[PDB]
Design a protein around this ligand. Structure first.
Ligand SMILES: [K+]
Ligand SMILES: [K+]
Ligand SMILES: [K+]
Ligand SMILES: [K+]
Ligand SMILES: [K+]
Ligand SMILES: [K+]
Ligand SMILES: [K+]
Ligand SMILES: [K+]
Ligand SMILES: [K+]
Ligand SMILES: [K+]
Ligand SMILES: [K+]
Ligand SMILES: [K+]
Ligand SMILES: [K+]
Ligand SMILES: [K+]
Ligand SMILES: [K+]
Ligand SMILES: [K+]
Ligand SMILES: [K+]
Ligand SMILES: [K+]
Ligand SMILES: [K+]
Ligand SMILES: [K+]
Ligand SMILES: [K+]
Ligand SMILES: [K+]
Ligand SMILES: [K+]
Ligand SMILES: [K+]
Ligand SMILES: [K+]
Ligand SMILES: [K+]
Ligand SMILES: [K+]
Ligand SMILES: [K+]
Ligand SMILES: [K+]
Ligand SMILES: [K+]
Ligand SMILES: [Mg+2]
Ligand SMILES: [Mg+2]
Ligand SMILES: [Mg+2]
Ligand SMILES: [Mg+2]
Ligand SMILES: [Mg+2]
Ligand SMILES: [Mg+2]
Ligand SMILES: [Mg+2]
Ligand SMILES: [Mg+2]
Ligand SMILES: [Mg+2]
Ligand SMILES: [Mg+2]
Ligand SMILES: [Mg+2]
Ligand SMILES: [Mg+2]
Ligand SMILES: [Mg+2]
Ligand SMILES: [Mg+2]
Ligand SMILES: [Mg+2]
Ligand SMILES: [Mg+2]
Ligand SMILES: [Mg+2]
Ligand SMILES: [Mg+2]
Ligand SMILES: [Mg+2]
Ligand SMILES: [Mg+2]
Ligand SMILES: [Mg+2]
Ligand SMILES: [Mg+2]
Ligand SMILES: [Mg+2]
Ligand SMILES: [Mg+2]
Ligand SMILES: [Mg+2]
Ligand SMILES: [Mg+2]
Ligand SMILES: [Mg+2]
Ligand SMILES: [Mg+2]
Ligand SMILES: [Mg+2]
Ligand SMILES: [Mg+2]
Ligand SMILES: [Mg+2]
Ligand SMILES: [Mg+2]
Ligand SMILES: [Mg+2]
Ligand SMILES: [Mg+2]
Ligand SMILES: [Mg+2]
Ligand SMILES: [Mg+2]
Ligand SMILES: [Mg+2]
Ligand SMILES: [Mg+2]
Ligand SMILES: [Mg+2]
Ligand SMILES: [Mg+2]
Ligand SMILES: [Mg+2]
Ligand SMILES: [Zn+2]
Lengths: 122, 125, 206, 53, 114
RNA sequence: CACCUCGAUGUCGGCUCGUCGCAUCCUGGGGCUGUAGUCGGUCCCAAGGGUUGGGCUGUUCGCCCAUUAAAGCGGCACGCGAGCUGGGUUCAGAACGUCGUGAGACAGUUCGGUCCCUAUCCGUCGCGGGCGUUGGAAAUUUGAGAGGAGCUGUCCUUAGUACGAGAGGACCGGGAUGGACUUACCGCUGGUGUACCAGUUGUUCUGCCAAGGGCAUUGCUGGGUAGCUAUGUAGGGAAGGGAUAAACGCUGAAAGCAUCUAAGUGUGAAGCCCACCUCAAGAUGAGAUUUCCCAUUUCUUUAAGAAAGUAAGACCCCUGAGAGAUGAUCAGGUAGAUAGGUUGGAAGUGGAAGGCUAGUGAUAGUUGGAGCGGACCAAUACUAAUCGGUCGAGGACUUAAC
RNA sequence: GUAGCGAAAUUCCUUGUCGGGUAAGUUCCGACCCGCACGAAAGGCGUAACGAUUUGGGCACUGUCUCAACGAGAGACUCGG
RNA sequence: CUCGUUAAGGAACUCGGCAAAAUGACCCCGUAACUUCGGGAGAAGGGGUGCUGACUUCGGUCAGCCGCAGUGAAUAGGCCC
RNA sequence: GUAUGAGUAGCGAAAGACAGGUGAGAAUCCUGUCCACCGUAUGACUAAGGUUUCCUGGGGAAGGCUCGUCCGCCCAGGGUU
RNA sequence: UAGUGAACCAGUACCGUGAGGGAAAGGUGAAAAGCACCCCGGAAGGGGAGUGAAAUAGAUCCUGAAACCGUGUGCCUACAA
């Protein structure tokens, strides 16, 4: 459950470290975003040499959340942090590497490139 | 569920221990309807512990029964004092060994003058 | 098709492919057709159905006479089912859960649990007022209306008794039917407290 | 808020229509024959259910 | 309740090993990436067990790639091919929620060898 | 303008709650186009529903950021202060600029500054009692009427087809899956869970040890049952009829032609009536069906008379919860599992006490998944629902048919 | 009308213009100076320390809020006075 | 009304972080600009705290034990630009 | 003087339980037991102020926000060396 | 409710630090002959029995209005604005 003003870590080397949520795309009144959803975010803390830099308005996809997801089989997955990956319009990650585990929900959302780069998909 | 009896949790617990011990001592007391309908379960559970009779049940009861003098006699030219807990395990337990629950009964009586509070007599069978 | 039963409770079932779905267990001891209503006698077509045999001391001479036609014990619940083929039902006939098959789509009718006197916030899901910043308006039902009418318009929703309403949930799925135990497992959750009456009918939308 | 108009005798009496006492549950006591409240001990003879208590 | 238990007794599984919170277990969880199906091993410590009968579930926690992950499984789910008890841990409570805050060495659990 | 209000009609903005108009912001239908297609422009019908989250400012407004199908315009005392706020504007303090010889003042700013009222009536939301409904009862019902609901994106296919030189790129039609909203429910994820379990500090009490109680926000801390719950789960706005709006007709004269119209006949919208959900015979127009009771007794009077026992039945009273402010509702009252207890479980907690073993000791192992266990489940009349009482029909007349 | 300061507790026009900070800043800070209408003891400018002073930003923190849920107690509700 | 808890988020509330939350004791390490040289300063930011043995120069240290947590409750600064 | 509001608001910070006694009558008075509260005080002394409220025996009209067999109340005696 | 504020233990009670302000309150019967005795009740208070011409003249005592409150019932009233 990610909403406006919610902050997330960045799970890639795109240059940004911590981002802040601006919008939860996908609906007029939509309030909250969960894994696999895309958000509009701002970079609040960036690596000094990175490509993405502080204060830039970017799009990102949530790849893991404290309130995780429910699988059709009745199982659940929950993570210890909220992390997102900065992506281009075509879902291609801006960075070259993904850090930390990623939720399997991304596959059906068709973030195939991120899934491949992920060190582990759960 | 259980009735609140218009007391905080600790106050309700303290009052229930008092009334249950008073019933253990006297074997018949007059209270209000609500107090009686709660004291029945508490006192009957205490009697269950007494029936069990082992040390574990003894200590469990001691947590609840008040430390009061159930009775006093003079035996062998010496005064013998029996506490509420001792009376439970020595008298009330053996007495009800045969009954399967329902050790107490409640008889409705007239309302109290000061408040019109419905009054009952609760007593061992 | 329709039947009357009791909301036993809720559990979950693993379907084929291992998907886990919540189900409501509704027991329906074979209902009995107590009376058949027709255009000629009553002006409309329906079958009266009785359920949950009742102890005799709890019944009345008029009620016993009413069920005598069907030659069964007194029934605790009686309800009329419409939109059925009268030719297929006759007084004394039994209706069992097997009338439905797994995967049937049904409408389930119940009486929602009662909540008693409830405020507007819970009863109508209205917004609270601010809880600080000097607010003295927390759980109140809002303005009653404009000045001009010199009155309050009807349907200005306020606090009152909540629940106890007849609610129908549509397009539920009959997950399983156990004839031996007179049980129907319906995907989802249905209105009403446990042991309350439940009416299953073939979904009208279908 | 205060009463805009005084309440008339008739309206006052109408409201008090339901402000009445009632006495229920009286029936003869088996032991002594006096009237008693059902399910209560008879205050006269102190018997309930045919036994002294 | 007895009626519900009778209905769900059929789907109750039988090969479940006797484990409690604090034990390390390996879960052979079936996964599907399309037509093909696969077994993905999720190994970690049992943090929580709750529920009764068919509704019973258990949670397993592992730190993968520096991030804590918890997976909750129905105890009797058929999608878990096998549950394997790797180790028995010594814990003093049913729910190990405190482990979430701890990292690395602080999260270690003494084995008992039941 | 000065007609109500100066023996008081509270003023901006915000919040809560909406409701209405249509000069329609989106969605629906349609005509014209300087409409190839995708987009549009303009106009016509259309008010069913929907029509945002922030930065700045007391703000309305406005600008900006980011979204959306859309971010409509207005009225309702610029709706709504006996419903809330009080940041702004009008009190007393103080200061700046400015005016004044001055006290002071604004042709201006700035910091600070008391928002009272127990609801009588109508109105609104719920819930009872009375009587009626023409013999008295127990159920099941029809639906006059009324309320609710009414939104919509994106993707796939049709099809890279129609159109286009290309770029680009469909109508219609068929599928999938969302947003917001909403009706239920706690099996799952969680929340709570003050008579559940455990750990623990201080002090005090049970004579002491051991084991416990009191108080310290439930002392604190970690969990947690039932119940209540959303952020959790399930479902809903699906299809389809009838009459229409704008618009398009067919046939057809008046008016040899022409013409949607006059007669005649049809298509046509998220709109209207149905369809779906709920309430509903106090619908005094009081409806209908099934079942039950039976024509009693006494006195007055031809009385639709009066009163008194009753029947079928209902209630008082009592045990309760799936119900509940109280009434009410529903489950029961020994023709008994209604509650309490008891017995056995379950959740829940996490290994009781008393012992034994090891250790100098703190403590660990073991006896033993133990002990404890509110509300949950199943049995069991052990306790209490005893004994009783009250109310409750005998059915008017006229005229058709039989 | 000097030094100093200047859209200020003073700047109406005004949310002046530029820069910083924010995704976005009529407030805030830095600078500029056409000072409507600063200015030297009704002191000018600056100033460590101090302030239940006014103002803006950040970390932490949270039911302030998204958006409300549960529990305890007092009143409210029923009964007697 | 008074109080306790609250998933995910964490000021998006609001005129304004109003209220609440958070910090809070002692010991140790460590501590900036600026300054009137006194301060700033408890800046900040960190670490330790229970019980049992052994040895202590008596303040410690070494070893071991337990818990989610040791100023285990109560009473004690939020901080910075 | 008496209504209406209305048998309504309120009955003024907090723990009492039961047994026995008294008595026409007891949640409220007495006795006993347990429980609970204050304890740099809610304890013990004093100054001012009050001015008999002190003690003993009676009473239950009124006062006591209920009740009252009881009282700092009423009645009768007495008490300050 | 006039007449002095004061027909009555009034410049009192009461109010105020003080100056000062400042009330309310008349009527049994000719005569107390002021209800012995009995009954319900703890009393209060009643019902008898008595006194009296009269007790619905019983000490709240001459007369005893109205508001206000209640009991009884001849007529009317639960489809009405
Ligand atoms: K005026
Ligand atoms: K058009
Ligand atoms: K509309
Ligand atoms: K704002
Ligand atoms: K603002
Ligand atoms: K409007
Ligand atoms: K106000
Ligand atoms: K008003
Ligand atoms: K009125
Ligand atoms: K202790
Ligand atoms: K104590
Ligand atoms: K909990
Ligand atoms: K009727
Ligand atoms: K043990
Ligand atoms: K157990
Ligand atoms: K300037
Ligand atoms: K100036
Ligand atoms: K800027
Ligand atoms: K300052
Ligand atoms: K200050
Ligand atoms: K809170
Ligand atoms: K918010
Ligand atoms: K500082
Ligand atoms: K530690
Ligand atoms: K401090
Ligand atoms: K009055
Ligand atoms: K009154
Ligand atoms: K006395
Ligand atoms: K007279
Ligand atoms: K009258
Ligand atoms: Mg306590
Ligand atoms: Mg006692
Ligand atoms: Mg809101
Ligand atoms: Mg009007
Ligand atoms: Mg378990
Ligand atoms: Mg004029
Ligand atoms: Mg006036
Ligand atoms: Mg129009
Ligand atoms: Mg901000
Ligand atoms: Mg207005
Ligand atoms: Mg108003
Ligand atoms: Mg001058
Ligand atoms: Mg002016
Ligand atoms: Mg101030
Ligand atoms: Mg749940
Ligand atoms: Mg459950
Ligand atoms: Mg000890
Ligand atoms: Mg049962
Ligand atoms: Mg500026
Ligand atoms: Mg700028
Ligand atoms: Mg000057
Ligand atoms: Mg000068
Ligand atoms: Mg100066
Ligand atoms: Mg009362
Ligand atoms: Mg929270
Ligand atoms: Mg949390
Ligand atoms: Mg804001
Ligand atoms: Mg806002
Ligand atoms: Mg504050
Ligand atoms: Mg502490
Ligand atoms: Mg009132
Ligand atoms: Mg008091
Ligand atoms: Mg102190
Ligand atoms: Mg005295
Ligand atoms: Mg005395
Ligand atoms: Mg009194
Ligand atoms: Mg005078
Ligand atoms: Mg007379
Ligand atoms: Mg007189
Ligand atoms: Mg009518
Ligand atoms: Mg009438
Ligand atoms: Zn008797």
């Amino acid at each position: 459950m990610i909403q406006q003003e919610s902050r997330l870590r960045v799970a890639d080397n795109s240059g940004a470290r911590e981002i802040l949520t601006i919008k939860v795309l996908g609906g007029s009144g939509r309030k909250t975003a969960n894994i696999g959803d895309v958000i509009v975010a701002t970079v609040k803390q960036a690596t000094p040499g990175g490509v993405v830099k502080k204060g830039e308005v970017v799009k990102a996809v949530i790849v893991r959340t404290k309130s995780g997801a429910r699988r059709a089989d009745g199982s659940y997955i929950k993570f210890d942090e909220n992390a997102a990956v900065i992506i281009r319009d075509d879902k291609s990650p801006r960075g070259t590497r993904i850090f930390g585990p990623v939720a399997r929900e991304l596959r059906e959302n068709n973030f195939m490139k991120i899934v491949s780069l992920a060190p582990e998909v759960l | 569920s259980y009735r609140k009896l218009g007391r905080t949790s600790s106050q309700r617990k303290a009052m229930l221990r008092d009334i249950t011990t008073d019933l253990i001592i006297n074997e018949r007391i007059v209270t209000t309807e609500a107090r009686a309908k709660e004291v029945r379960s508490t006192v009957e559970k205490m009697i269950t512990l007494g029936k069990r009779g082992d040390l574990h049940a003894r200590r469990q009861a001691a947590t609840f029964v008040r430390n009061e003098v159930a009775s006093v006699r003079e035996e062998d030219e010496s005064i013998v004092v029996e506490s509420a807990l001792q009376k439970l395990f020595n008298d009330l337990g053996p007495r009800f060994a045969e009954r399967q629950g329902g050790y107490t009964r409640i008889l409705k009586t007239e309302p109290r003058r000061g408040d019109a509070a419905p009054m009952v007599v609760i007593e061992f069978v | 098709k329709g039947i009357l039963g009791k909301k036993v409770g809720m559990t979950q079932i693993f379907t084929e492919s291992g998907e886990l779905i919540p189900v409501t267990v509704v027991e329906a001891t074979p209902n009995v057709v107590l009376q058949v209503k027709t255009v000629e006698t009553d002006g409309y077509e329906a079958i009266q159905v009785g359920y949950q045999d009742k102890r005799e001391v709890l019944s009345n001479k008029p009620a016993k006479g009413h069920v005598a036609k069907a030659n069964t014990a007194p029934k605790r619940f009686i309800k009329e089912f419409k939109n059925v083929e009268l030719g297929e039902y006759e007084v004394g006939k039994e209706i069992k859960v097997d009338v439905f098959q797994a995967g049937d789509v049904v409408d389930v009718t119940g009486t929602t649990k009662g909540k008693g006197f409830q405020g507007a916030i819970k009863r109508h899901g209205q917004s609270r007022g601010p809880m600080s910043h000097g607010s003295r308006y927390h759980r109140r039902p809002g303005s009653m209306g404009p000045v001009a009418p010199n009155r309050v318009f009807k349907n200005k929703r306020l606090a009152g008794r909540m629940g106890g309403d007849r609610v129908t949930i549509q397009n539920l799925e009959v997950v399983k039917v156990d004839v031996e135990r007179n049980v129907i497992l319906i995907k989802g959750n249905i209105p009403g407290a446990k042991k309350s009456l439940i009416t299953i009918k073939s979904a009208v939308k279908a | 808020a205060v009463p805009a108009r005084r309440t008339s005798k008739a309206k006052k009496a109408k409201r008090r229509t339901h402000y009445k006492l009632t006495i229920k549950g009286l029936n003869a006591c088996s032991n002594c024959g006096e009237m008693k409240k059902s399910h209560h001990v008879c205050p006269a003879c102190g018997h309930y259910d045919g036994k002294d208590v | 309740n007895p009626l519900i238990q009778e209905l769900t007794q059929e789907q109750l599984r039988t090969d479940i090993p006797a484990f409690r919170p604090g034990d390390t277990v390996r879960v052979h969880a079936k996964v599907v990436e399309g037509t093909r199906e696969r077994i993905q091993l999720f190994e970690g410590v049992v943090i929580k067990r709750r529920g009764a009968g068919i509704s019973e579930t258990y949670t397993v926690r592992k730190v993968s790639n520096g991030v804590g992950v918890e997976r909750t499984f129905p105890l009797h789910t058929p999608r878990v091919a096998q549950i394997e008890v790797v180790r028995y841990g010594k814990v003093r409570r049913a729910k190990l929620y405190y482990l979430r805050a701890l990292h690395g060495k602080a999260a270690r659990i003494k084995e008992i060898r039941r």
